[PDB]
Symmetry: C2
């Protein structure tokens, strides 16, 4: 009983897995190495790295099993561990994105607490959650009995593959909505092409790398041509190799370690380019309290001025009790007196943080330039 | 060529469709009737109502066509318009929930023209997608022709049903993440039992009535028993009939016109029950500015006092530069002079809006009771 000589696609898969493991070995090594990199966000990156390394090891071991080994059960356990690793990688991506969202959101409500209630509950639910879906394909969902349809990848039952695809589509939807929220929040703290490209390649790469296999899984059949599955399984390993370059090496702290081994932002730009060192502000009380303008304009060395709390309440009325309420005259009067006193105090430019200020106040009403977002 | 006598499941479906149409007719008529009900969020409810009415009309017309008409083209266009209506219904539900979430996210900027543009774009997009995945695919690419291996519902191709199922699962993921966010953000104005029950029941209502079928969409083929299809389609009509009771028919002004035709809430009510009319607050600057605490306690007639701006900055240091920074002594120092001056001014009780205050402040340190969230 000699082992048939594998076709070239087998050695292509072997090379892909080999470079995947080689690429991730260094990243897991450095992640686990330096004692300083024990931040809560680093644990998720480590989880992703070890999951992908496990995937590569499983792939090369399976190729070995199909190369002068001639075994039966080891092939089954290797396909099981491969499914384990892929589900773990998808869970690591979801956990990373949810951590990033919760990080960038908490800087507005100003309420941060706990590290064991949140990080470990989801870190243990991605590897632990994959236990069931990595033990089902071996326990009682095999193809050797004969009753199972054994749809696409031999041996895997139709039901198990369908369940996996449903889970994948669910997590894709959650990821899409999360990225929409993060883009909406980060746009405010900003041109259009750069803003889109900030988060447009990662989601496109994820989709273009993982969609074809699941689409085939749904549409396929047992008697499908054999080259189709081999053609569609490559993007999964390609994403496995791409992901650590884009989610781990981009962080500049690891870059420093290696080198040792080896709408408001643009407004601030415009203000700094005009040579003005002092700006006055008219906006809502929440906006001034939020502290965004001070940090953004201090990043370029520009100082902002907000009137006193009584004139803050005056601007409150002028915007909402004034322009917004239909009493345009009161709004323009209050805004004009506030702008006048601010200009007298030494401001060379005035910023109208909301549209209502621009509605009743124009350039001709001020000696200094009037600039709006 | 006589028409075979339908099975009793057919008249069951007819009864369900008639009830759906009758229930939705009144609500759509009332919504379109009163000129005062032209709010931006009323348009989405109207769209959902018209979609459900269209679905009911399509179902009853299809039963009619399969009864003593014996026509082929009419049945085809009727099943097409049925798919049209169901897709429109699910899209309208998603639009309603996204509108609610954006409305509850920010309250100041919700009432403007921006929400008008958003509403118009959402309505156009949902009905255009209904056009693109409804009548247009069904009046082509069908089964009443050469071999297409049409799937469970006669006549519908396998590929069309798979595409519909994929879209449904993506929409389900979006809905799940939205409801998680809304449940997170409403459990700060809390009592909690009512909110958690609502946000766990209205989700399951749509989750358990539309997913007997989309799973059968995949695990099945033409050579399938006919009992398994006529049973899983009933929950869709049941959800169609249940929908205009949950999202609509629950607000109060609709009730009035019908009759004419026919964690902080808990603390605030606890303080109110104790008989205290005056409370003092220690929390972050953003929290005191945000206007939540005073609004909630004024809902019960309780007055909250916040320290002056200098003492607010002192509390800022005591929380962050103090307890949070590791200099616990400075934090407790600043917090306890703050509590002392507030108590001397007439505070009958003190609230610690952050855990940091409670860490270094205990009940024995003040004469008045100390209450924490």
């Amino acid at each position: 009983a000699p082992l048939p000589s594998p076709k070239a696609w087998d050695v292509v898969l072997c090379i892909s897995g080999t470079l995947v493991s080689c690429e991730n070995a260094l990243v897991v090594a450095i992640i686990v190495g330096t004692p300083a990199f024990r931040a809560p966000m680093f644990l998720l990156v480590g989880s992703l790295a070890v999951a992908d390394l496990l995937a590569g090891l499983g792939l090369v071991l399976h190729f070995a099993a199909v190369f002068c080994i001639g075994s039966a059960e080891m092939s089954l356990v290797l396909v099981g561990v491969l499914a384990m690793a892929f589900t773990a990688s998808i869970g690591s991506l979801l956990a990373i994105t949810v951590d990033r969202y919760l990080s960038l959101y908490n800087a507005l409500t100003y309420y941060s607490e706990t590290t064991v209630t949140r990080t470990y509950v989801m870190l243990a639910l991605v590897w632990g959650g994959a236990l069931g879906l990595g033990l089902l394909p071996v326990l009682a969902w095999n193809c050797l009995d004969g009753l199972t349809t054994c749809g696409v990848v031999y041996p895997l039952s139709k039901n198990h593959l369908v369940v996996l695809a449903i889970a994948f589509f669910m997590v894709f939807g959650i990821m899409l909505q999360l990225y929409a929220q993060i883009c909406r929040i980060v746009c405010r703290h900003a041109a259009t092409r750069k803003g889109i490209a900030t988060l447009a390649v990662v989601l496109g790469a994820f989709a273009a790398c993982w969609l074809p296999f699941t689409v085939y899984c749904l549409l396929g059949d047992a008697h499908s041509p054999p080259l189709y599955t081999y053609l569609t399984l490559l993007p999964a390993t390609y994403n496995s190799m791409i992901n650590p370059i884009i989610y781990a090496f981009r962080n500049q702290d690891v870059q420093k370690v290696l080198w040792a081994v080896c709408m408001i932002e643009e407004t601030a730009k415009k203000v700094k380019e005009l040579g003005f060192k002092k700006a006055g502000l008219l906006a809502t009380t929440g906006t001034i309290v939020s502290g965004v303008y001070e940090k953004e304009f201090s990043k370029y060395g520009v100082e902002i001025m907000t009137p006193t709390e009584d004139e803050q309440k005056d601007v409150m009325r002028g915007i909402y009790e004034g322009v917004k309420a239909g009493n345009l005259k009161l709004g323009r009067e209050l805004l004009l007196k506030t702008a006048k006193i601010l200009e007298e105090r030494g401001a060379e430019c005035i910023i109208a943080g909301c549209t209502e200020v621009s509605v009743v106040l124009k350039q001709d009403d001020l000696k200094v330039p009037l600039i709006d977002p």
